[PDB]
Symmetry: C2
Subunit: 245 residues, 2 copies
């Protein structure tokens, strides 16, 4: 499994500030063993791909489940590809819990993005009430299941565990808590899909990661990389890229 560092810019930046960030990213030495992906705001997918060096891949932050249609405000994997992006983030916690995207919709997006030739960063994770009621496994397994049932080929998927229970709650995850969930996820893939899928699928950590914390997280045997939030908008992202070095 190649180490995978994704940067989720979320709804941040303008051409000036993003252009600057991109200059900083273009100066990064990307390790030969590490795959790097940046997810700009949708209005800047095209802009970012044009300005970023090809050593960094571009992802969309979301997409819909058909190629063209009467879906005001949506983009398709076809448009994503057309702008030179090769990845899409699907099932992000904000899509699920702010915007109410169901597991079934997320699964249908995943199959369509994969069929169009995109890589997919598929996100799962439990909230605090779910964790504290003891149902972390039930939640993340069902989210992973609904994805799994809506797809066939696992080679272009990266799984991203998001400890949603650590977002603005006053709790945070230790590296050991992250490892524990990643290990259970890998175990789910083994028992529900195949050994081969379990062994080759990157499971990346989508919780808080900084330049200070990235190496300890990366050393966890079942943590294969990151989907970075806030630090992805800073030079600090370049150091996170180096987490396995």
């Amino acid at each position: 499994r190649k180490f995978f560092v994704g940067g989720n810019w979320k709804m941040n930046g303008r051409k000036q500030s993003l252009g600057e960030l991109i200059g900083t990213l273009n100066a990064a030495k990307v390790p030969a063993d590490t795959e790097v992906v940046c997810a700009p705001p949708t209005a800047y997918i095209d802009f970012a791909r044009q300005k970023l060096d090809p050593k960094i891949a571009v992802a969309a932050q979301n997409c819909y489940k058909v190629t063209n249609g009467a879906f005001t405000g949506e983009i398709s994997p076809g448009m994503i590809k057309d702008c030179g992006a090769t990845w899409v983030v699907l099932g992000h916690s904000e899509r699920r819990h702010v915007f109410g995207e169901s597991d079934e919709l997320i699964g249908q997006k995943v199959a369509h993005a994969l069929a169009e030739g995109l890589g997919v960063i598929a996100c799962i994770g439990e909230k605090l009430d779910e964790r504290e009621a003891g149902i972390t496994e039930k939640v993340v397994f069902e989210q992973t299941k609904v994805i799994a049932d809506n797809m066939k080929d696992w080679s272009k998927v990266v799984l991203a565990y998001e400890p949603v229970w650590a977002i603005g709650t006053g709790k945070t995850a230790t590296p050991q808590q992250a490892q524990e969930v990643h290990e259970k996820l890998r175990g789910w893939l083994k028992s529900n899909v195949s050994d081969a899928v379990a062994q080759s699928t990157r499971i990346i950590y989508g919780g808080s990661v900084t330049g200070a914390t990235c190496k300890e997280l990366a050393s966890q045997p079942d943590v294969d990389g990151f989907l970075v939030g806030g630090a992805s908008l800073k030079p600090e992202f370049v150091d996170i890229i180096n987490a396995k070095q």
Copy 2:
């Protein structure tokens, strides 16, 4: 003195090559000074479209969120839309409301923020078939317009688009006279609840089925001030609709 307004909502259609062809057609087209023309591309192509379209055509975003930056993966802000050279945003479109579950409250907040950020707003309202058949057209469109109104300090940068959602994909058709009835009622609501100044100056555009053949009759209705066009906005037929008053 209400300037005729024609919006083209490209929805989730096209790629750089095919939209480039469309833009070529629009650039070559005669736009009467009469008319304010606005095109809304897929969000991935707002920048692309603004760079290639002649300045006689304004660019809209198809949706936005309600804060300037934030942890809202998949969203764009009015600041981003303006940064890409677009001067309008479409809000409350029937697909946002009914396919993607956007509440009146959220739409009102978006309108407020977009207006505060300097964008124009194409604010969409309309009733479904079940609401129409229950006799509650007025109640529905008045409540939607009210929520939008509660989130307004200035009306000069707003265009209201009535979408007869009951008549889009249902088998049912709407007549020019049915469109006019809703439009005059909305304007009456503006007069009673906002001001006569707003009622007299606010473009109320029709967002139902419009083609080259029907646009002229619709445009002649006294309270129909233009169009928010769907499918036909992707075709040269759009130029016929731009010229519906000519």
